[PDB]
Amino acid sequence: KVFGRCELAAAMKRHGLDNYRGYSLGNWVCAAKFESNFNTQATNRNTDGSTDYGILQINSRWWCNDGRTPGSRNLCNIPCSALLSSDITASVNCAKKIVSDGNGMNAWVAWRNRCKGTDVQAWIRGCRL
Template sequence: MKQQGMDGYQGVSLENWVCLAYYESSYFTYAKNFNPGDQSTDYGILQINSRWWCNDGKTPRSHNGCNIDCEALLTDNIYESLKCAKRIVKDPLGMSAWVGWRNNCKNKDLSEFIKGCSLMISNSSFYCYSLCKATSTIQQKNRNHPS
């Protein structure tokens, strides 16, 4: 995420992007969730919606704002998801376009999401974030519930 210029993009910190991915998909790049209300589906690590942002060929009245096939968002290479997220966050809703971010990340201390992470660990540095978040969550639980 940092390598793709997400830290500070449109004023959004890296911690917010990582928190978004955590609450939207649990860092699962192949996540796909159907929304029966409007017949749309959310795709990928950032759960990008087919009503507004991508084309899945089945969502009624799809806008395809990112001009991308939704299936391209279901991959371990998150470049296309990040590119689309940059488009989404420019809209008036900004990060609030994502319910997971609104409900869990907005106006919160998110330092735990990157605490102890080396941002230069590898080319797939996002993997580091999920490990760091999982590690810090486990460490916190262990502090709160000693054996």
């Protein structure tokens, strides 16, 4: 599913990500924009042999099981393919664990390099939320 911007904002807000661990909704929308372009089906292989999955590009070393990343963990206890679903519940549940892990949203490299410090509220402009 390719979410619209405000579509995604609404769903993230309903699933409790607005200000989760202190990160406003626009931070999460910005992260999703640059991680996946709002496409739930996005997958991208990392140099280390892990893969990132879904709307928030959750990597398969620490976070989900894809059966092909030797040495990795599965800290969200889910198949990585479940992170590609049209319903973002599993991705949000897992993202809550990731952002709680100690470095906040810096865990998302696109967020640190493209969102952090910027006017992230722009990402929720216009939305009836």
